């Protein structure tokens, strides 16, 4: 997968390109991240990348000309078939369904805003889709871009409970007893099918207790329905 990035702070992307599973994906050429910086497309002495909003108020916007030229250059490098994404709080809120959809693209270009964002007409003329990572306010689009890249990278062949839309079950490792708390005996049992069912029941229980709205979005199998009923009965005992 190839991801173009437009950012005033390309070095921030080292966080995903030099570390962990995404870092491995980049080193092994499974994932390519290529950055263009609007600062390199300025022509004035002081390499100005911001500009004043019409109508005044506080805050600056990204300057149109350097940003537009960086986008054009990215598009030219991507060739045909690249979807241009602007990350913003007015975008579609990212969720796992969204990620799986985004992961179908072989090529993406991600535009990272700073200051109060970008001129609305650039969204109209250059941007295909707008996406948010959540209903909170951040200082720039770079962390959101990295969040998206990380999420989609998991779908790239060779890189590696929300799979079934449920919260994860609890996990245990050594030691057997930790501050008086013991590992559930079923996990020490060796009984593969009992363990599978325990994990599924736990996942259903936690989704019900913590995020019951997520259960309304699922069509549970007969086994899931049984396990949920048993977990609800136990909770009510
Ligand atoms: O502030 C946010 N919250 C949630 N998602 C996102 S994606 C991009 C941004 C962003 C932040 C600052 C300026 C321009 C864009 C954002």
From Swiss-Prot:
Which GO biological-process labels does this protein carry? tRNA N1-guanine methylation
Principal place where this protein is found? Answer: cytoplasm
Which residues participate in S-adenosyl-L-methionine binding?
Answer: 86, 113, 133-138
- Is tRNA processing set as a keyword in this record? yes
Which reaction equations make up its catalytic activity?
guanosine(37) in tRNA + S-adenosyl-L-methionine = N(1)-methylguanosine(37) in tRNA + S-adenosyl-L-homocysteine + H(+)
Q: What does this protein do?
A: Specifically methylates guanosine-37 in various tRNAs.
- Quaternary assembly: Homodimer.
Please identify the protein, giving its name as recorded: tRNA (guanine-N(1)-)-methyltransferase
State the organism of origin. Answer: Haemophilus influenzae (strain ATCC 51907 / DSM 11121 / KW20 / Rd)
